[PDB]
Amino acid sequence: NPFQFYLTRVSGVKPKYNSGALHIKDILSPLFGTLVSSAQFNYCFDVDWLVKQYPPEFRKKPILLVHGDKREAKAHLHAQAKPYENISLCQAKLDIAFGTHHTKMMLLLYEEGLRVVIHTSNLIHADWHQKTQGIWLSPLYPRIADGTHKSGESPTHFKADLISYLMAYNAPSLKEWIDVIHKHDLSETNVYLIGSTPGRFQGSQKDNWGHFRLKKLLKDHASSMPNAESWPVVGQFSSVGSLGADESKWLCSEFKESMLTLGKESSSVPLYLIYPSVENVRTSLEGYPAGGSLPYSIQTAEKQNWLHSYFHKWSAETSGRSNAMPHIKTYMRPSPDFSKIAWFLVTSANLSKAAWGALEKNGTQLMIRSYELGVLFLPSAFGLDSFKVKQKFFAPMATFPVPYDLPPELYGSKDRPWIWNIPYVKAPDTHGNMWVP
């Protein structure tokens, strides 16, 4: 397969549903490269657990933890890392209120080259245990020979775009990694980078990040087809922000408008949002504790009940993962019969203005609060007009492995979105327990 899109291993499904899945220990294995040093970008870290995931022979190599924690949370992270003298930390600046460092990425420098891993899992045991999570594995990028002047750039501009993403941190530890990336050949990369970084972007910079970055790539590198108004948009996420009092405030006015872009020319497009119901969580492998990783607060939800009419259940028979709650985030543009897709994005970005950006100043500036990162699969980058949808996730190679079932199934009238901070004491979970926050 050209796509190198993987799911994490799920403990408790039959082996056929883990054939071709990856655990973190597989990613860090010596079979992937002889590790010299690494950078782990993430939100949440269990450092003791993380070090145990590296092969014993590599556990003393330098590790950089890139995080967004402040104040007492920052002190707790430093205390976790203090026993390991090979671990350094980089605090990503979050100068806009209510932002988060969400990006999940590994930079893996080897004796043999460099690898980039963009994924969806926090660096804690539970995120790799019984959840549906996504991973993109870059090729092994070789080093450019000393004295050789070449760009090492791909047709998708991934090298310059990754360097631009890292430059936004303005961090000395990341300038070191920028210099590493400069020295490697990333030309084989077939995905486009879609990042978010905190700021207020206008003019030339408006298209660099968030939903305007997606819109720009779709304008420039996808083509519109006849009956494009009938091709739905699907968004699938683990958390929901405050979107406003009605769908015209943001969801259907700027977010959907960016997602429905195709090609360079001048809406009734269906919008499917996939988010676990209470029943999905209750009957999951983890039970109600899975909802600890589905942060949707009652304070947010009660202001936007209009949104829940867009919600569809989590179902993943195709990958044996209907009971493995999603922490992956994906967005895509299927055909009206869901047999093809015009593009697919795996990302850290949830359904929130903080992650994707919100227009300000009479539509002239895009304001983003958080760091996010994902990779976009466009048919044109593979010499194709569209991707066929792979019927069975683990079963030509030009078919794209969509990890959940299509078409998405609407919530039933008795279903409710998972809301993490209210009790569920009416039916017990798969471990015999209720949920009492």
Ligand SMILES: O=C(O)c1ccc(Nc2c(-c3ccccc3O)nc3ccccn23)cc1C(=O)O
């Ligand atoms: O992707 C996801 O679903 C995700 C969602 C939220 C998140 N952080 C977070 C948490 C929080 C606090 C403690 C324990 C878990 C939590 O979620 N509370 C807020 C409040 C506002 C903004 C962010 N908040 C991190 C991730 C992630 O996995 O990176």
